[model samples]
Target: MAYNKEEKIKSLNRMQYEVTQNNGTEPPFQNEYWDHKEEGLYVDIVSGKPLFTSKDKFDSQCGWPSFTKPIEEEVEEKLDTSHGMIRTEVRSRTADSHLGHVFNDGPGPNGLRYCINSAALRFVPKHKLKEEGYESYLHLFNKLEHH
Candidate 1:
């Protein structure tokens, strides 16, 4: 699904545009989803491509929405050397929207912290998954329940 660039620009608000398009960052602990604990899926704000799920979410105390990983094939990682720091920048494969960065200082086995921007994503809660055309991801929650 190809997204219209003009349409996306028009649809996004200023903060969203700064984060996704201009590679800007939002203040920690002051942004959306920093402490959000709802069961849902996070999609790209521009293209609506599935990016992360609540199942992978964790509180890293980093004041950003942290995840263990994305939905695997839906993301792309690149070497980022901005702000005099080296980091892995995560972007949506389909929309190429800048989601956030990934760090190695995470808990659990994988030890990855996907520090994402709230402005770059849209959350679709579990109950609304089917209606939002994200029924395919419901299996993720199903697997979670068994564990």
Candidate 2:
């Protein structure tokens, strides 16, 4: 399910384009989802592949958004040396967009720290999940009030 990179370039804003395409970083505490508590699903800005759920989101206070993990198999990790240091790079499997980095300094059983850029994600709130064709994900917000 590979997507055309050019299409994403044309559709995304400057900051999103830089982060996902150029592997740039967004400012901490100032980005959209870094401190967002709204219940929703976060998907890749380019391929729209399901990435993170709000339930898995936590404030790592790293400036950028942090997650315990991404939806299984939605992302691929690689050894990155572009920054003059060894690091694991996360990228969307479908669009191959640069997502962020993962580290072992984290909570839970696996101790995985998924440090991500806010520009690379788009939020699909719980209330609109069904209407937005993400009906299957409604269970992620089972605690929400039903109308």
Candidate 3:
């Protein structure tokens, strides 16, 4: 069943507590399954729809947000995970999607890697996210948001 935007957002907000606040993982490599460089789109783990793109990728050693790029101006949200361990949690601001964690191991210009979880994403080849009914996010490919 398809979930409305509000439902998607609320469900993910609840997940934030479990996955982000609780040190939970979506499933490892399975969490960010689409993390590979192959062209495609990463969607909300709960809704299984588009969010980010391979084009926005960068190499951050921290583990997550490695890609210097973002799907758009608001694809992911950054939360202070410095609860004591000096970590950052990446969540979808609008949908409250749990993307994973962002780190400071990135390459060059910006030394930060968003070591995210496969559990938080649903990878859709760039072509299919739209064809299968996720085209709304197509703009994300060129969208930009800054911290």
Candidate 4:
């Protein structure tokens, strides 16, 4: 049963709805995934698209869940100046859910920071990947680190 936008909108709590739909931001450090250091997948709340992996998560101490990268195409960027500041707003490609923003300051290989809102995502622990129909993602956790 694929829910329409209306149904999907109703599925989230008030905060989730605001951030995912209205391009709002959850408070830094005070959000769910800000300090979350679990191995898992972060999927879009509206469409359940796997947008990020725990493998890329980083702590920018930015009060939000910072990521070194995502699935690339899964996140769509758009120029935003609504807050009297120029910013690259991030959104889920298919669902067009307001994710957050990407910054140039990062320790990532490409110097990127995906400062995302927890309200826009649902985390699936790595252990539950197979049972959650994310068998394709199970292999991602095959080893801790080879380096």
What TM-score should be assigned to candidate 3?
0.55
- Name the regions of candidate 2 deviating beyond 4 angstroms: 1-9, 27-36, 83-85, 93-96, 107-110, 139-147
- Total backbone collisions for each predicted model: 0, 1, 30, 2
**What is the per-residue lDDT of model 1 for residues 10-105, given as tens digits with 9 covering 90 to 100?**
667566668767767665544344334578777665665667786666543555678676666667766768788787777655555567878766
lDDT of 1 at 112: 62
Instruction: Give lDDT: candidate 3, residue 145.
Output: 60
Comparing 2 and 3 by lDDT, which wins?
Answer: 2
Q: Give lDDT tens digits, candidate 3, residues 64-121.
A: 4455444434455454644566655556655545666556655533444445544465
Residue by residue across 40-96, what tens digits does model 2's lDDT show?
A: 777665655566687677553666677777665566666667667766666755554
TM-score of predicted model 2?
Answer: 0.67
Candidate 1 vs candidate 3: which has greater TM-score?
1
The full ranking of all candidates by TM-score, starting with the best, is: 2, 1, 4, 3
Best by lDDT: 1
lDDT of each: 0.66, 0.64, 0.55, 0.64
> 2-89, model 4: which lDDT tens digit per residue?
8776776566646666776666766644444533557877766666556677776654365567777766646776666767767666
